[PDB]
């Protein structure tokens, strides 16, 4: 019951009677948790105004700090006591940096045969970022370059529909089994519905379920608000250059839309073009690896954004989409991925991999070069290497196994 | 620098900022669904001297659309690439006298000026007419980014879809121009009209647009990057139209009182320009009777 | 003085003067038969620096009527002697884009601006409405004489009896304004309309005309005599309207290529103004389709392209364009 | 009687009828249509109807239907109500030929509808109906031979 923060500060300090002010602002982010979190925003806000009239001219004092930071006391205790679900974060990031250097040597090919606005990207662009379930973050490389979220919004937009319309209404129109016929896949399953939400045939139908009665502006605006909450209000844009591409020249999607309309597999009174247009708009949302790592960490958690703590997605929505990305996220390469990686990941022709490690962390890679099946060459290698050196595979940690890094100790 | 006493300059700008913050405004442009969503209490101002001095008071960092402020920019882009004679052979260069909708043409059979909706479509039609839609927007966006010194240059597809599905008047003007042979031969109307909607939906903060206006004040040289984006003649033409045609019917009562080249927008933007001194931009959603922000236009006066 | 090396400055103007001399327009004046009798081969220009430094070449000694070049002046008489708030209660301040005849009022019921014929009648109605007709003309004439520094100022009664027997659109405008009740209370429209004809019919030479437009190139103070004719606010108010509304439909084209406050006239006059530099007054009886002198517009267009006088030059470097007063 | 469809004209008007598209979008901004009505479908139907093909023999009976109180003389079916004919004829007289509505009520006095295909659906109430074809048009968008014949 008693607030032990006063003694906690003594542990925070190194034991000396004084410390320079300069040493506190810098070197404090080493714990991973960034200083830009909304949770600790209140601390930075007040100090800026008191410095002018404080009779000290550069002293924050311990007594003043303890009183102001009262409601957010619990969060700071876990941060510096190394009670987060990933301690020794320096070692964790140190290993991540090593594979980042090694994997950089590889080079794939066939960046984009279609969507010309994607063919203009730099092949040698490579980066990665991870945001653990506790908000602890580390990014290296070209994380700050926006990239389109094509085919990564499919797991997200599926979660939007189910959490707002129920599990039985959504799956009346889209199957939940892999097709093994590429992502274009002009084919429906035995019961006359697209095989899964992840294929283009299913992504259009789930996109058709989002506010079918509203107008086009509100349909997009509804999803983008969730995608902001999912990302914790990080960077979230819209590449109109790629949206104008993939619509004049994206023709295989149009065939699917008209093929689906032919089989009358849409809900009642729904325009295919309005639903198909939204699929291009969601596909055209651009996010950075740093911002897009909070996504895939929101649904690595039970549907709560780790940074702000908001409840965005139902736990049933995250459980269902994670169980679906595992077998259907990467199309034909899902089996190869699940064999070596065994994590829920979602591919993209823009080089994005929306990697997820439930209860642990969520990554987001970027490599415009692709492989034959429509997956990033460098990004896939990192996931394969990372699992072999961090035990993230689902069927590991049996009882004791080998040493395999620190076993939660 | 052109304003040595910039510290005192902000002392007057913020005082006037608070002086006009008490005023209310007119309608909030509810005839398109998306712009009604904005909070009418937004009020911010930014300026950029041609040397690089910058100050910002208020909500300058809230993004908003260049719903009509992109007309001088796309005009300057066209002049800088194709020449003055070629561009104005398709669009007039004189004020119209009607509103910005102005479903009408002058005696010559061409739009009155490159600032009315009829003329903004034609100048948008002239930008690289032999390429596809993705390249057309990317070509314009490339110079707009360089005008803003690689500042935040976004896009608001919520507005673009809202206008593309509701902006019926602009469709009437597009089909009216196509019927009068107002486009170059072999040019599609819808591609030009669609591009015009895309440019109108470009999203900028006041900081991003303050440097964008200061380029025109600096005469085709972004102050904070030393670029050479626009030809000298292109900006001289843009300021000559943006003066007598920037604010539509309110071009008088602004040239009379303010006497500066400024451009309004239904999103509350006012792309003010002070030649050889600075470039200022003001954000205030609630419009006035003739299509300009009550707070912004009163602030400029 | 603001223009040193005057020999170099005038020498350039002389070369341009001959260059424009070859161009020929047409359609001198469809109406006012007295103006259609003028010589199409008449071409004269004059200037008057803000500090008296003046030059004149051509036919600057031939009087011509001041039709529609007294509008910025008679407006300045009312704006200074009645304040800016009162004058613009009856006339707007925005361009019309409907020619100068323009039987059309703005949305709120007032004429669009003082420069159109519908607005010049209203502003002419504001000048000493309580006095008789002789005093109304003389009141403006005294200021008009002071503006030109007591230079030549006649009255072409031949042109005044024309434009009144045959000037019918002005009468239709005059009665149209009466219907809409856009005149001050207790005012006879015909008396104000007649005053508009008389002011239009005032005749000046280019040499005397250039003294005007150097008065209001300054802050109202005359350059020759140094008097204080008009309020400083009056000159700003009228200049900001001449730039936007001076040339009517051609205002945008003129502001684009010239970017100076200039006022058109069917007599061929163009009261071009270079603020804080000088004041020009070209003369060429033949007009263009829009009601502007072909030679006068060409001279203004060429001069700005060589002397940096545009409102939006000197951005960073632009072209050389000779020394800009430095 | 004969009732066809000139698809060639239909495609010539959809691709070139640019003014009719401006009106449709101009109307849509003013909320002139009823609630929950697509303008494109309504505008498209206007193009389709204008492309319907008939002959002068088919048109003459089509005009005679309006003459005979909205009852076709050669079948006798009560195809149209009495109010529809009275409203229709009273508008063709004043609005049938647009600017030439005058100079036709003045010289002809009968309700006739002009077309750019040369037709003039001339109606003589309680007597007959008549359609005159000549593609040559005058300035006001009426057939020259047809309107001279009517006079
Ligand atoms: N494989 C993918 O990422 C699909 C890319 C995009 N949705 C398209 O179909 O064009
Ligand atoms: N003048 C404006 O701000 C409106 C711009 C927008 N493109 C429109 O015409 O609706
Ligand atoms: N310059 C002009 O427009 C001529 C005007 C005409 N002389 C009048 O008295 O009104
Ligand atoms: N005579 C007519 O009314 C011709 C109509 C034709 N469809 C048009 O739009 O011009």
Numbering used by the authors:
A (entry chain F): 69 to 477
B (entry chain D): 152 to 452
C (entry chain A): 152 to 477
D (entry chain C): 302 to 452
From the article:
The glutaminase enzymes GAC and GLS2 catalyze the hydrolysis of glutamine to glutamate, satisfying the ‘glutamine addiction’ of cancer cells. All glutaminase enzymes share a catalytic domain containing identical active site residues and a conserved mechanism for hydrolyzing glutamine to glutamate. Here we demonstrate that the ability of GAC and GLS2 to form filaments is directly coupled to their catalytic activity and present their cryo-EM structures which provide a view of the conformational states essential for catalysis. Filament formation guides an ‘activation loop’ to assume a specific conformation that works together with a ‘lid’ to close over the active site and position glutamine for nucleophilic attack by an essential serine.
We also obtained a 3.3 Å cryo-EM structure of the constitutively active recombinant human GLS2 (K253A) mutant that formed a filament immediately after the addition of glutamine alone (and prior to substrate depletion), as this mutant does not require an anionic activator to be catalytically competent. The tetramers are arranged in a side-by-side architecture and each successive tetramer is rotated ~48 degrees relative to the filament axis, with the helical rise of ~66 Å. Interestingly, in the filament structure for the constitutively active GLS2 mutant, Arg320 (which corresponds to Arg387 in GAC) forms the same type of salt bridge in the absence of Pi, as that seen when Pi binds to GAC(Y466W). The formation of these Arg-Glu salt bridges, together with the substitution of a less bulky alanine residue for lysine, allows the movement of the activation loops into a space that otherwise would only occur when Pi binds, and likely explains why the Lys-to-Ala substitutions within the loops yield enzymes that no longer require the binding of an anionic activator. An additional conformational change that occurs specifically in the constitutively active GLS2 filament structure, when compared to the tetrameric apo-enzyme, results in a hydrogen bonding network introduced by the activation loops. Hydrogen bonds that form between Arg250 and Asp400 of GLS2 appear to ‘stretch’ the alpha helix containing Asp400, causing Tyr399 on the N-terminal end of the alpha helix to insert further into the active site where the substrate binds. Following the insertion of Tyr399, Glu258 from the adjacent dimer forms a hydrogen bond with Lys440, which displaces the loop containing Lys440, and therefore makes space for the insertion of Tyr399. As a result, Tyr399 is now in close proximity to both Lys222 and the substrate, which is necessary for catalysis.
